[PDB]
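User: I'm putting together a teaching handout on how sequence relates to shape, and I'd like one worked example. Could you take response regulatory protein from Pseudomonas fluorescens, show the sequence you're using, and then write out its predicted structure as tokens right after it?

Assistant: Happy to. First the sequence, then the structure tokens directly below it.
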Amino acid sequence: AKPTVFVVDDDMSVREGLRNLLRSAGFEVETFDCASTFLEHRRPEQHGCLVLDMRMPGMSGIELQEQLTAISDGIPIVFITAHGDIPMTVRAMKAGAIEFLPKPFEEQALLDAIEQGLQLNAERRQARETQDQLEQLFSSLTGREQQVLQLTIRGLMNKQIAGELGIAEVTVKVHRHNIMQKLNVRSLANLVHLVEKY
Ligand SMILES: [Mg+2]
């Protein structure tokens, strides 16, 4: 749905402050003062950025990240550190971290980061509802139709496909005429795009 930033910091200085700043910037805000609460009320199918403290009672920022990874939730993470005596990992950096901001932070860089995170979440999101519906469409094909696709996009003509499947040429006209309709294409050109964009 909407674009929310989920602030997960134990500190009231932060959860309120950020809740406020981000709201004074177009965003809804959902605040949690522990990771596990978050995990419970997280709905993977809900667009947004996660702004996440690293040191927290219970599951640390990193450990929370490890779960989101484990359940293939890809909410981009913008971590926020407090200390020098700990460097983030290569796994933490690979585990979809957008940015690391120190506490307290240049309010413009947080703002920078949360955008960059939102942009990427909406991109990783489109490229999954797009490619899903492009496989809902392909699902609706039967098995005889799927042989008539895999032969057409290969360049064959009605008669040859027939004299290649041992069916009536008229069967093929209908088979093709159906494929086009299931797949919502109206031009051979498209057919071979969809079918290539698998
Ligand atoms: Mg903390």
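A couple of points you could highlight for students: The longest helix spans residues 107-139. Strands lie at 4-8, 28-32, 48-53, 77-81, 97-102.
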